[PDB]
Design a protein around this nucleic acid. Structure first.
Ligand SMILES: Cc1cn([C@H]2C[C@H](O)[C@@H](COP(=O)(O)OP(=O)(O)OP(=O)(O)O)O2)c(=O)[nH]c1=O
Ligand SMILES: [Mg+2]
Lengths: 218, 1005, 419
DNA sequence: CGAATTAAGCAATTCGTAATCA
DNA sequence: TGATTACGAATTGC
């Protein structure tokens, strides 16, 4: 574990050894946007912006990525709801339960499954204002997602319209799958079968499948 | 409403979908009409009766005919008739999207269905009736029955229009500006209202000037403002703060202009304004619909395009504005990129290429020269455009190299009179152009001053007016109107899509008129097929006049002549041996007579096969022939319109329009040969190519060795139709109207698809032109048939053949005489290629000129020419290497950026990616860039070159060569000497020299 | 993303698992789905492959060439026969091992193989051996059953199997020459055996043994032997009269057998088999010159260039023998499927198949000629280029082109009325 | 606050690098 | 360490 000091808040970024060749450019890019970024109250709290930088990247195979954090009650790790209140986590847990077969579950968490790293494209958002910090984060998001792509084998995007040009945003090709957002109209996410497709793709590249039943919380 | 002329059509993306029309009446009032928008499906009567939920609305379409256009191979002549069904069709409209399992005609857009079904033209003038219109707002109306509202059409009339052209200049210290650190210093506008008034004003940011300087500026004539409400547009220079500047910009961009035109404004200017406004203040730019029920903010989105070649790959990017008020935001960068080709697409390059004129020296002495321009110097119209641009210009380039500063300018009645600051030039006529400025913006920003502020104000207003100048030069309005009329598309969608989309309107109209539906039931399979025929040149240097003959629209006319459509193909007959080949030939020649059916032999589809015959029917005209007829009629109209033009601008516009229509007509063929298209027909494409080859062979055979004696003309071979026997005479002995005492011989030297290069043993050009005209008339009247005609292009003197597609010559047009100035023509040589050099071209030009002069003189004792050329080249190269006086601008090459590469290593993409990583300015996915070869200075002359691509570096606008770097001259020298050696005749001396300098083996023809 | 995509991915994975067990069609489908997947998902772990060498060795071990030991469990013993080896797959054709092609098989073998495959899902492949036009199902592998039930099923469908032996072993014996001889005798068959394939109940890997030794003997004459209609087989006899068995014509071509010389041969308790891995133009004409000019190489056999005629047409359609042209139309209408077979094919294919010419050689000969055809019938022919006559097969075929044209005209003028 | 209709063909030369051969 | 061939990419002429 290593730490670096930035000029503005949170004044301390702790990162894993797998994020070494990106930290310097991340600090350089953050120094010019922190001053304008912190003029407003943001979710999550600035202390929780860079807490996924601890996770290792050499033992991951699949990445699930959104476009923004939850507008309210941001925890810091993507796709988390300790009280099980968000609609997106509800629908994702329902799909996983339907695929597996478990009926009675108290909660679901994507940060416990081995080989799966949840991610947010934009690391911050105004309270009640979806996608209000895109200009501040653009370069950092590009750089971090490019670094994640080099290590994972299958990259899964949630949101058809948000990631319409994901291939132009990355240089080296990777196995990209884009799916409907969990809150899509017409209940489109119910008929999606992206998890089995993901497992087939990894078993097609001599990679061990992912046990989606592991993330359940009782 | 009554008389209205259409301007734009646009959609709404709210909870409820709508279609909008923007029109202006005779007086000048603007009227909006709102239309409900549906989803259009075509279903059969049985399926219509079997629809479980009743449709919202259905309209009968009458009896129609469905054809299966799938192609199958056949080994015998028991060919089954094509599947053809006749049934009553319906057109159903649905407010929300619906899925029908057996729905046909699914390749067309909803807007096309709206236009064609309702009988409405996108750029027509109409006389609306208010009985079918309901007023819902001041300036907006609602129409539920568009078919009865737009029933009456009226002649076209002129209306006033409004424009806005703008440009900004941002502060920067060492690199491309950044929105979070760097402010805006200037903003210029060009404002035209409906009354016809032209206003120019520039806003200067006062926050980076001292108070004393502000007081001096106000005393000098400028106006100081503190609020938005106290600005008048009738003043040129106004200085205010950054917030007031942004508020003024937001107010101006929220109006309902007809056009807002920028140059690369959708990526830099508007984005910078929006982001800076959102950073300094919390305000946003809001666009509202005509009915005021949907409000959106400005947010520029990206549309990425992919290539249809291997591994797909992204090859273009474009930025657009998401307004919904009817205003057309136009970016000249994308339009110029997609229209015409240059080495670079910066504003300076386009201005230099577009605004040029020849000038006569009128005065001399000291460090100034006075130039004069008029209709007697360059042409009719060029001086007028130069004088128009000179009203705001500051720097003029003389003789393509020297940049000069304008001191005084005088605009005469017809031309211009300008005085510049340049050294003495010892000639009489020079070339002037508007190009680069010899100013350092970074240095001027480091030490800011009032004079520098005024200078940047002038530069910014000139940049803003260049947008209008280019807008008038390229004829965007006429092209927009014509495209809306022809393609049946909204005015804001004309310059956005390729041939696969802009032909669907005419295709749908033609299908509805003909009552035909085309369907597929199998998978399309792709095979390679041959193309046009190119003849090998017989000689290099000719020294005799060469006559050029070309075919008029060869491939569309072949398609019309042979009725080559996927729905008129009887079948394809193949045989794997010489026995069934003979049997099938004998039976086919009598089952399908030759006045109605046409049979075309082709190269076999697969290696096992040895024969392939495709039979086409000509009783009923196809669809592709009628599409081609439409496009050819349009091209003929614009061609005669060009012929009637007088000024240079109109000539250029009309020539470009007819060129675009030609390209679309050929794109019809290209699509008909494209696998992923709905008009795919492998046999049709092969047949068209084969018929073209037959035509070139026929013309070459009948023209080669064709003498004329007395007043009579002789052709080499009998003139017969190479497909079937016809009723015309086949006698090769034909009357001529020429004088009796003429005697000449004719010969064929070169050809390329629709072209035959014919040689005549003469030297003057009047007789050559007269003979060519008579020969063209004779060939059209006797040799050709049906819809085939040729055209006498030009007479070529001093023609030189280098390769199969590389030649140089002087051109005399058909309408020319001996006392006329020749024009130099280069085709494929190392002077029109964008990736060769700038220093290479000068050397090859001077060396070809010297070689021509020396061959005219002529010594060639044993190897005198080769020795002299080698010695001169060695001396010149050594001098260039030692002196190093050549600037880096002469060693710059250009290349396009794209992501369509096999394998992801690809040094080119890696170089561009690293440059993007380490620099603020980014190279996009369709952007041309400059690069060169650079090596450390301590490295001496290198004999064996092991790596070359490792020394490629991207040359930015701020690039300055270091003291430990040098231009890697070896690659350029090797290329130039390899090109020069090929022109000479000796080998051993060239091999020895090339080994001595570079130690490699030269390649020859 | 949809169900169709999931099914396509699963079927592509299924094809990828069995790719050594493939042919042209399977490889084409696999390549098409690879292209679709790499287009849709922008990258896929598998790529396009085009050579594809068919192999089975992952289910086998190294052959035992000397006495060894056994001990545990029950064993099932199978024989190994002589001749070309083929493998039948799921919905596929016969494919030759090592040089995968699509061999042509009658109709009965096809029906039987298709129905035994339809019996259950879990057949990886079926092993076949061709020995003098005598198909023999030799073995079948699966992860669920044992080669006993499928053997009985094949017997009751009509394709022959070898008798399978179930035995048990307790003590430590050295599997040697005497035990091999006894167990080989226990088969009680006269067809050639070369090896034994034995399994343990449950284990997938199958191991074989081969006890032999070298020998040298003289070659006294190459002569043909009838094994059917128009089909001949090669054979060489010794001074003592021993019969050296040869798999195929290709075996002689690549083994470079020589008249009146000495060769090396591995002999076993009953017979001997000539060995391979010792140019082509010299041998391909020397053998024909030695046996007789009137022979042409028909694929993997030797065929005759006899006069043929009217009844050689009749035997192929499997109809009542006739000597009259009018009879050739009588029962064809009465026949339910004979006329369907007539109408489905073309005149050239049936005419070529009636006299048994090779495909490629005859096509080349026809493409090197000129014809004068009147009323869809051939009346004259001649040669244009004589280089093709260097091949002995081409000249032997040109020997009786008259019979071909006669039967061609007959079939054409009877097709004019049969349809 | 949720969504979201694209795409012309082949022939010819020049240059660098990877792959195979005396 | 030469010689030769093959492939991909870029640009131009039809
Ligand atoms: C220019 C061009 C030609 N072609 C094909 C079709 C043409 O028949 C053929 C010959 O090229 P051109 O000489 O350009 O053909 P044209 O006969 O249309 O010319 P014009 O009417 O001006 O005399 O090349 C294309 O496919 N695409 C193109 O962009
Ligand atoms: Mg032409």
């Amino acid at each position: 574990m290593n730490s670096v000091t930035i000029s503005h808040a949170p004044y301390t970024i702790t990162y894993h050894d797998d994020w070494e060749p990106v930290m310097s450019q991340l600090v350089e890019f953050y120094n010019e946007v922190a001053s304008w970024l912190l003029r407003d109250e943001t979710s999550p709290i600035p202390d929780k912006f860079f807490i996924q930088l601890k996770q290792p990247l050499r033992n991951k195979r699949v990445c699930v990525c959104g476009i923004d954090p939850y507008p309210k009650d941001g925890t810091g790790v993507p796709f988390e709801s300790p009280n099980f209140t968000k609609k997106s986590i509800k629908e994702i847990a329902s799909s996983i339960s339907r695929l597996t077969g478990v009926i009675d579950y108290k909660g679901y968490n994507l940060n416990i499954i081995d080989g799966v790293i949840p991610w947010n494209y934009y690391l911050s958002c105004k309270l009640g204002e979806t996608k209000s910090h895109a200009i501040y984060w653009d370069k950092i998001s590009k750089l971090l997602l490019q670094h994640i792509t080099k290590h994972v084998s299958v990259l899964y995007c949630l949101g058809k319209t948000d990631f319409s040009n994901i291939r132009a945003k990355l240089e080296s090709p990777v196995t990209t799958i884009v799916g409907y957002h969990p809150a899509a109209r017409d209940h489109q996410f119910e008929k999606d079968r992206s998890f089995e497709i993901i497992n087939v793709l990894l078993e097609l590249d001599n990679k061990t499948p992912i046990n989606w039943a592991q993330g359940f919380i009782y | 409403s009554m008389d209205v002329r259409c301007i734009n059509w646009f959609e709404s993306h709210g909870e409820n979908r709508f279609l909008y029309l923007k029109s202006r009446c005779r007086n000048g009032e603007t009227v909006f009409i709102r239309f409900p928008h549906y989803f259009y499906y075509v279903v059969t009567d049985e399926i219509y009766q079997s629809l479980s939920p009743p449709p919202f609305n259905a309209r009968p379409m009458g009896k129609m005919r469905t054809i299966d256009i799938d192609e199958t191979i056949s080994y015998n002549l028991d060919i089954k008739d094509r599947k053809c069904s006749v049934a009553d069709m319906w057109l159903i409209e649905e407010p929300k999207k619906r899925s029908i399992q057996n729905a046909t005609m699914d390749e067309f857009f909803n807007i096309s269905w709206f236009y064609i079904s309702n009988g409405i033209s996108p750029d027509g003038c109409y006389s609306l009736d208010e009985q079918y219109l309901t007023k819902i707002n001041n300036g907006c109306y609602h129409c539920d029955d568009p078919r009865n509202c737009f029933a009456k059409e009226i002649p076209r009339f002129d209306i006033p229009r409004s424009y806005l052209f703008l440009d900004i200049e941002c502060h920067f210290d060492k690199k491309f500006p950044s929105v979070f650190i760097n402010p805006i210093s200037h903003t210029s506008y060009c404002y035209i209202d409906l009354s016809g008034k032209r206003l120019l004003f520039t806003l200067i940011n006062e926050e980076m000037l001292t108070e004393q300087e502000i007081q001096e500026a106000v005393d000098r004539g400028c106006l100081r403002i503190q609020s938005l409400m106290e600005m008048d547009y009738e003043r040129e220079l106004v200085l205010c703060s950054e917030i007031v500047l942004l508020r003024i910009a937001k107010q101006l961009l929220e109006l309902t202009f007809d056009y807002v035109v920028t140059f690369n404004g959708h990526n830099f200017d508007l984005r910078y304004i929006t982001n800076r406004l959102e950073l300094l203040t919390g305000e946003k730019i809001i666009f509202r619909s005509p009915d005021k029920k949907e409000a959106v903010h400005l947010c520029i989105y990206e549309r990425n395009q992919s290539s249809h070649k291997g591994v797909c790959g992204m090859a273009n990017t474009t930025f657009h504005v998401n307004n919904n008020n009817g205003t057309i935001f136009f970016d000249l960068y994308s339009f110029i990129q997609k229209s015409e080709k240059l080495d670079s697409y910066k504003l300076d390059s386009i201005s230099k290429n577009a605004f040029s004129c020849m000038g006569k020296v009128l005065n001399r002495g000291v460090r100034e020269m006075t130039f004069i321009g008029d209709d007697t110097t360059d042409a009719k119209g060029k001086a007028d455009t130069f004088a128009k641009v000179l009203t705001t210009g500051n720097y003029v380039t003389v003789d393509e190299d020297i940049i000069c500063k304008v001191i005084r300018k005088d605009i005469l009645e017809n031309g211009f009179k300008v005085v510049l600051s340049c050294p003495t030039l010892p000639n009489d006529i020079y070339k002037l152009s508007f190009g680069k400025d010899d100013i350092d913006l970074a240095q001027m920003y480091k030490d800011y001053n009032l004079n520098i502020a005024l200078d940047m104000a002038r530069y910014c207003i000139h940049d803003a007016c260049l947008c209008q100048y280019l807008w008038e030069y390229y004829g965007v309005e006429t092209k927009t109107d014509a495209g809306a009329a022809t393609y049946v598309l909204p005015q804001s969608m004309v310059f956005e899509y390729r041939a696969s989309t802009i032909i669907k309107g005419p295709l749908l109209k033609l299908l509805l008129e003909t009552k035909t539906i085309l369907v597929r039931s199998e998978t399309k399979q792709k095979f390679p097929y041959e193309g046009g025929k190119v003849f090998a040149p017989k000689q290099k240097m000719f020294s005799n006049n060469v006559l050029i003959f070309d075919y008029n629209s060869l491939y569309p006319n072949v398609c019309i002549f042979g009725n080559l459509s996927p729905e008129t193909l009887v079948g394809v007959v193949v045989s794997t041996n010489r026995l069934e080949e003979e049997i099938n030939n004998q039976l086919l020649l009598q089952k399908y007579p030759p006045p109605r059916y046409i049979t075309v032999h082709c190269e076999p589809r697969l290696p096992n096969l040895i024969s392939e015959i495709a039979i086409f029917d000509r009783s009923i005209e196809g669809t592709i022939p009628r599409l081609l007829r439409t496009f050819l009629a349009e091209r003929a109209r614009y061609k005669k319109m060009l012929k009637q033009a007088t000024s240079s601008t109109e000539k250029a516009i009309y020539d470009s329009m007819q060129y675009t229509y030609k390209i679309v007509a050929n794109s019809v063929y290209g699509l008909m040969g494209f696998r992923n298209s709905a008009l795919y027909s492998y046999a049709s494409a092969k047949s068209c190519t084969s018929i073209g080859r037959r035509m070139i062979l026929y013309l070459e055979s009948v023209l080669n060795g064709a003498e004329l004696s007395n007043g009579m003309l002789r052709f080499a071979n009998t003139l017969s139709n190479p497909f079937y026997m016809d009723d015309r005479d086949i006698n090769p002995i034909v009357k001529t109207s020429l004088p009796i005492d003429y005697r000449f011989r004719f010969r064929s030297v070169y050809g390329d698809t629709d072209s035959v290069f014919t040689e005549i043993d003469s030297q003057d050009v009047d007789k050559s032109i007269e003979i060519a005209k008579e020969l063209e008339r004779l060939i059209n009247s006797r040799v050709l048939f049906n819809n085939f005609k040729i055209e006498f292009e030009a007479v070529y003197k001093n023609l030189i053949m280098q390769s199969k597609k590389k030649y140089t010559t002087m051109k005399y047009s058909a309408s020319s005489n001996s006392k006329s100035v020749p024009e130099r023509i280069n085709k494929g040589t190392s002077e029109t290629r964008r990736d060769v050099s700038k220093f290479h071209k000068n050397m090859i030009k001077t060396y070809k000129t010297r070689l021509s002069e020396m061959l005219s003189e002529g010594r060639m004792n044993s190897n005198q020419v080769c020795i002299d050329i080698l010695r001169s080249l060695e001396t010149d190269l050594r001098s260039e290497f030692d002196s190093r006086s050549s600037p880096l601008e002469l060693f710059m090459l250009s290349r396009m950026h794209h992501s369509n590469y096999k394998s992801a290593d690809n040094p080119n993409m890696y170089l561009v990616t690293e440059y993007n990583k380490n620099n603020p300015e980014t190279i996009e996915l369709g952007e041309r860039y400059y690069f060169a070869y650079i090596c450390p200075a301590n490295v001496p002359w290198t004999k064996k070159l092991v790596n070359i691509k490792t020394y490629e570096t991207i040359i930015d606008r701020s690039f300055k060569l270091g003291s430990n770097q040098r231009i890697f001259y070896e690659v350029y020298f090797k290329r130039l000497t390899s090109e020069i050696v090929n022109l000479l005749d000796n080998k051993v001396l060239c091999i020895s020299f090339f080994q001595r300098m570079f130690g490699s083996r030269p390649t020859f023809y | 993303t949809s169900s169709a995509d999931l099914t396509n991915l699963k079927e592509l994975l299924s094809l990828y698992k069995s790719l050594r067990f493939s042919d042209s069609v399977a490889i084409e489908k696999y390549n098409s789905l690879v292209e679709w997947g790499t287009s849709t998902y922008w990258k896929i772990g598998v790529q396009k492959v085009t050579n594809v060498e068919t192999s089975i060795s992952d289910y086998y071990d190294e052959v035992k060439n000397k006495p060894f030991n056994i001990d545990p469990g029950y064993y099932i013993f199978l024989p190994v026969y002589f001749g070309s080896v083929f493998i039948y797959s799921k919905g596929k054709n016969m494919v030759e091992l090592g040089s995968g092609n699509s061999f042509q098989i009658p109709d009965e073998i096809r029906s039987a193989c298709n129905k035994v495959l339809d019996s259950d899902n879990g057949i990886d492949f079926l092993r076949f051996v061709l020995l003098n036009n005598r198909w023999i199902m030799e073995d079948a592998i699966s992860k669920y059953q044992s080669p006993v039930n499928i053997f009985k099923l094949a017997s009751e469908y009509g394709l022959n199997i070898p008798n399978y032996l179930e035995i048990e072993i307790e003590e430590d014996t050295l599997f040697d020459d005497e035990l091999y001889s006894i167990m080989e005798r226990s088969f009680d068959d006269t067809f050639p055996k070369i090896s034994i394939s034995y399994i343990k109940l449950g284990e997938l890997k199958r191991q074989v043994v081969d006890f032999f030794k070298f020998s040298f003997m003289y070659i006294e004459s190459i002569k043909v032997d009838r094994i059917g209609d128009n089909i001949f087989i090669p054979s060489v006899i010794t001074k003592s009269g021993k019969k050296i068995l040869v798999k195929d014509v290709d075996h002689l071509i690549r083994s470079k057998v020589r008249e009146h010389t000495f060769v090396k041969v591995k002999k076993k308790n009953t017979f001997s088999i000539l060995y391979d891995y010792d140019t082509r133009g010299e041998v391909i004409k020397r053998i024909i010159d030695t046996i007789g000019r009137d022979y042409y190489v028909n694929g993997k056999y030797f065929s005759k260039v006899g006069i043929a005629g009217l009844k050689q047409l009749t035997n192929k359609l499997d109809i009542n023998e006739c000597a009259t042209v009018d009879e050739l139309v009588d029962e064809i209408n009465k026949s339910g499927t004979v006329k369907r077979k007539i109408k489905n094919q073309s005149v050239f294919d049936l005419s070529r198949e009636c006299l048994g010419y090779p495909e490629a050689d005859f096509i080349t000969l026809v493409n090197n000629m000129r014809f004068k055809i009147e009323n869809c019938k051939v009346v004259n022919f001649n040669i244009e280029n004589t280089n093709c006559l260097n091949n002995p097969s081409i000249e032997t075929i040109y020997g009786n082109f008259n019979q071909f044209v006669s039967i061609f005209n007959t079939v054409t003028d009877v097709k004019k009325r049969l349809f």
